[PDB]
Amino acid sequence: KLVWEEHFNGKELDTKNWNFELGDGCPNCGWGNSERQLYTKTNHKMENGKLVITAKKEGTQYTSTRITTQGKKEFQYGYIEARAKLPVGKGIWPAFWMLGSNIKTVGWPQCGEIDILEYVGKEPHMVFTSLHTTASHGNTINTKRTRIDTIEQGFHLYAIDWTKDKMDFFVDNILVYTFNPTDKTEAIWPYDQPFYFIINMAIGGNFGGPEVDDAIFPQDFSIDYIKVYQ
Amino acid sequence: KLVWEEHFNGKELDTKNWNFELGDGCPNCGWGNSERQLYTKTNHKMENGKLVITAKKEGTQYTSTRITTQGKKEFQYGYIEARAKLPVGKGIWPAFWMLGSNIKTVGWPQCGEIDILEYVGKEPHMVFTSLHTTASHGNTINTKRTRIDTIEQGFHLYAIDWTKDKMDFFVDNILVYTFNPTDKTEAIWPYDQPFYFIINMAIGGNFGGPEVDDAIFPQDFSIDYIKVYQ
Q: For residue A198, which of A3, A34, A31, A79 has the smallest C-alpha distance? A: A31
Strand A44-47 with A66-68, pairing: unpaired
In b/e form, how buried is each residue of A45-77, taking b as 16+ CB within 10 angstroms? beeeebbbbbbbbeeeebbbbbbbbbeebbbeb
CA distance linking residue B230 with residue A110, whole number of Å: 49
CA distance linking residue B12 with residue B42, whole number of Å: 11
Instruction: Count how many residues are written for chain B.
Output: 230
User: Does any CB of chain A come closer than 8 Å to the CB of residue B51?
Assistant: no
Resolution for this experimental structure (Å):
1.6
CA distance linking residue B5 with residue B28, whole number of Å: 30
Q: Would you say A18 and A4 are in contact if contact means Cβ atoms under 8 Å apart?
A: no
Q: Would you say B156 and B210 are in contact if contact means Cβ atoms under 8 Å apart?
A: no
Backbone angles phi, psi at B25, to 5 degrees: 95, -10
Q: Would you say A132 and A140 are in contact if contact means Cβ atoms under 8 Å apart?
A: yes
Backbone dihedral region for residue B34 (phi beyond 0: left; psi -120 to 50: alpha; all else: beta): left
Report H helices in chain A: 103-106, 205-208
Q: For residue B82, which of B51, B47, B54 has the smallest C-alpha distance? A: B51
Neighbouring residues of A200: CB distance < 8 A, sequence distance ≥ 6:
A21, A39, A53, A64, A65, A66, A67, A94, A95
User: Does any CB of chain A come closer than 8 Å to the CB of residue B171?
Assistant: yes
Burial class (CB in 10 A: 0-12, 13-18, 19+), A33: middle
Backbone dihedral region for residue B215 (phi beyond 0: left; psi -120 to 50: alpha; all else: beta): alpha
Partner-chain contact A176 B174, CB within 8 Å = yes
Burial class (CB in 10 A: 0-12, 13-18, 19+), B156: buried
Neighbouring residues of B141: CB distance < 8 A, sequence distance ≥ 6:
none
CA distance linking residue A23 with residue A45, whole number of Å: 18
Residues of A in contact with B144 (CB under 8 A): none
CB < 8 Å & 24+ apart, contacts of B9-15:
B9/B46, B9/B49, B10/B46, B11/B46, B12/B46, B13/B44, B13/B46, B13/B51, B13/B67
Domain count of chain A?
1
DSSP H or E run through A184: none
Residues of A in contact with B175 (CB under 8 A): 146-148
Q: Which residues pair with B76 in a beta bridge?
A: none
Neighbouring residues of A201: CB distance < 8 A, sequence distance ≥ 6:
A37, A53, A55, A64, A65, A66, A87, A92, A93, A94, A95, A219, A221
B113 flagged as catalytic: yes
Range of the domain at B188: 1-230
Q: Which residues pair with B189 in a beta bridge?
A: none
CA distance linking residue A41 with residue B172, whole number of Å: 37
Backbone angles phi, psi at B205, to 5 degrees: 85, 175
CA distance linking residue B193 with residue B205, whole number of Å: 30
Q: Which residues pair with A215 in a beta bridge?
A: none
Catalytic residue among B6, B35, B81, B118: B118
Determination approach: X-ray
**Would you give the DSSP letter of residue A148?**
B
Here the CATH number for the domain that contains residue B26 is 2.60.120.200
